[PDB]
Amino acid sequence: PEIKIVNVVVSTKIGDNIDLEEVAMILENAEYEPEQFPGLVCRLSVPKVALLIFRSGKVNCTGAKSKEEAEIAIKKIIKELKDAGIDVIENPEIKIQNMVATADLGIEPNLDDIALMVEGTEYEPEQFPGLVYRLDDPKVVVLIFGSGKVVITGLKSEEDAKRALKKILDTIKEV
Amino acid sequence: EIKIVNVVVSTKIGDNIDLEEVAMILENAEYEPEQFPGLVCRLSVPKVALLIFRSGKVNCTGAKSKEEAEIAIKKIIKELKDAGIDVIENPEIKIQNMVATADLGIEPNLDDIALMVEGTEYEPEQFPGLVYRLDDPKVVVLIFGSGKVVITGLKSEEDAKRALKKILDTIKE
Amino acid sequence: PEIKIVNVVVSTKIGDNIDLEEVAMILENAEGLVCRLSVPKVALLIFRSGKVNCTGAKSKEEAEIAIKKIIKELKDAGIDVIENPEIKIQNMVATADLGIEPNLDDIALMVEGTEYEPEQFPGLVYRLDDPKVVVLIFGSGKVVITGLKSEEDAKRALKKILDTIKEVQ
Amino acid sequence: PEIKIVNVVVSTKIGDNIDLEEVAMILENAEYEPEQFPGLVCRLSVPKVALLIFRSGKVNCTGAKSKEEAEIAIKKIIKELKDAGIDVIENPEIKIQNMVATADLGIEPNLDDIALMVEGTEYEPEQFPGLVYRLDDPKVVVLIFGSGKVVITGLKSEEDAKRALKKILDTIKEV
């Protein structure tokens, strides 16, 4: 009946007008094909994250379990580039773009009843698992599974995750 | 390329509905006034469910189309009217939601998309498929590794096509 | 404080390998090829490459109107054009009011990446790295933010500016 | 067109754990409000330069016409603190952090032309005088006025100011 943040998506900027051809030589597991895509994708083994680095120096990062874990990943790559003589932003702003939270309702819900009794939900066991439920405040998408597991996506903060859960729990309560 | 798999519809069938009597009239009707104030009636063929309130409000799920829902509703209304309940004979049926499906034709790289397209969420350990929430039109899109796309929150088949176009354009752009 | 977008610069592509000398025949006004519209009041610079640059629009949508209107003219004269081309914001000017009149000498000493020299230019110049913008701060408290690619970035820029200036006064 | 340096911003470190209360006791024109702001401000009249001094020993100095002028001012302050019995480094290295350079194009530029034809420029005469032009090498901000006056900021060296001027001139030439 409590929020667990399980993954975050973060944006940052680690430099300006970066030479991606040089970056691709420095970094490990760096995929760079300028004829096919503009960005460079770096998949870190430790921590287990993927980073997309643009010539502008903007970076998108997926896979981290938390902001702090994304921060380690980002700063590890900043150090690699700095050490190789790239001009970097050494303590970048790490902005949360998305958070994914889980909770367990503690009961196995009847998704057919929810789908019929709660407005703005959909459910089609043949097409996808679980029930989809969009909230307007906070602006999230909620997935509720037969196990009682709940997944909240689109979140901007842990506080919003808490607000989301209250609303979910209060709506399910009638049912 | 858009196929509608289910609809959710609403209607208004009357004003002062005695749910206890409705429960006597309809087969397989779930009514427990203390727990929830609405009556549930589930049909097996078609696999369609109605929720009926004392206010006369009706919600309906499980139908493949608005027309199939309308047939379900009309049948139930006739049972109630014949028993003596004051109901509206031809109520207006309003689409509240849909599940629409499409195929990309390719097996997409969801990792790339989650990395490359802002406003998407992909966490395969939680849920298969990428979640892509839109505002114009206001829909939730799920994209699967197979290339299957499910579009939910729709109010019409034409918003589905707007949604699908924006999806395809974004994954290109 | 609220941000006002005062101008945008947008780029697009209306095709490839345009013959500019024959474009000046179709579009009234054409000094690549410079074209000036009255409604909306915008200017467009078209290269043979197909690239278009546009200044003067209040918004992306105003620019979109001007580009679409000149596309529809080129189309009819037999030039091969893209009808709904992707338009991209290249720059903006955003303005805000701090809500206080700042001490520009205080900021120039106490905040790094600022310069101030009233005899050469009015206002204090403040460079940010993320978002990568140039900010002009005036004694009136008025700020001008340039180098922007989005309104979200203008919001992010102002938050950082206000926060740094709160630390000064 | 020739570069004139009009001002410099310099930094240095004058010691390790400087007692700012005692610095305020001896520097005339010293502003120190530790509850409001951690640094001490000293504003010199001759020459018109200002210093910001931190407990870390970090010093930032604005107003000087040159690095040397700034160093002279800093050493005068150091002598007072040394004379006062405050532990200071007597031979600090003065680092240029910023400079304002000016030049004259020799022509009265058509700023509207430049705003259209040169990328990374902005011009909004109702909001500010001059056209704003950012360079990435050297990393500077340039303001160009209808008079032909050019101001270059963000400079780390006089040599970089010259390199900036060549690029500005080359750009205007193409317009």
Sequence ranges of the domains in chain D: 1-9+97-175, 10-96
Beta-carbon-side half-sphere exposure of residue B127 (alpha carbons within 13 Å): 31
Asked if D136 is an interface residue toward chain A (Cβ–Cβ < 8 A), one would say yes
In the CATH scheme, what architecture does the domain A10-96 have? 2-Layer Sandwich (3.30)
Select the residue of B8, B116, B123 nearest A7 (Cβ to Cβ).
B123
CA-based nearest distance D162→chain C, Å = 18
Query: How are beta strands B39-43 and B48-52 bridged, if at all?
Result: antiparallel
Burial class (CB in 10 A: 0-12, 13-18, 19+), A50: buried
Would the CB atoms of C129 and A13 count as touching at under 8 Å? yes
Size of interface A-C (CB pairs under 8 A): 13
Which residue of A11, A58, A88 to mutate against C (max C Cβ within 10 Å)?
Answer: A58
Chain D CA closest to residue C142: D127
Chain A CA closest to residue B96: A120
The CA-atom distances, in angstroms, between C114 and each of A114, C117, D55, D100 are 58, 10, 22, 10
Q: Cα A22 vs. chain centroid, distance in angstroms?
A: 28
Query: What DSSP element (H or E) covers A97?
Result: strand A95-104
Residues D147-166 as b or e (16 or more Cβ within 10 Å = b):
eebbbbbbbeebebbbbbbe
D1-9+97-175 sits in which CATH class? alpha beta
Asked if A7 is an interface residue toward chain C (Cβ–Cβ < 8 A), one would say no
Contact B142, B150 (CB under 8 A): yes
Choices 3.40.50.2300, 3.30.56.10, 3.30.479.30, 3.30.310.10: CATH for C1-9+90-169: 3.30.310.10
Shortest CA distance to A49 belongs to which of B111, B126, B116, B129? B111
Q: Measure CA of the first residue to CA of the last residue in chain C; give whole Å.
A: 17
Chain C contact partners (≥3 CB pairs within 8 A): A, D
Shortest CA distance to A62 belongs to which of A24, A15, A100, A20? A100
Within 63-122 of D, beta carbons closer than 8 Å to C belong to 97-98, 100, 102, 112, 115-117, 119-122
Fold match flag (B1-8+96-173 vs B9-95): yes
- Side by side, the strands of the sheet bearing A95-104 are A30-31, A40-44, A49-53, A58-62, A4-13, A95-104, A149-155, A139-144, A131-136, A121-122
Would the CB atoms of A100 and B126 count as touching at under 8 Å? yes
In the CATH scheme, what architecture does the domain B1-8+96-173 have? 2-Layer Sandwich (3.30)
Chain C positions touching A56 (Cβ under 8 A) are 132
Contact A89, C130 (CB under 8 A): yes
Domain C10-89: CATH superfamily is TATA-Binding Protein (3.30.310.10)
Contact A28, A86 (CB under 8 A): no
Chain B positions touching A3 (Cβ under 8 A) are none
Whole-number Å distance between alpha carbons of B69 and B61: 8
Contact D32, D24 (CB under 8 A): yes
Asked if A13 is an interface residue toward chain C (Cβ–Cβ < 8 A), one would say yes
In the CATH scheme, what architecture does the domain B9-95 have? 2-Layer Sandwich (3.30)
Whole-number Å distance between alpha carbons of B81 and D125: 75
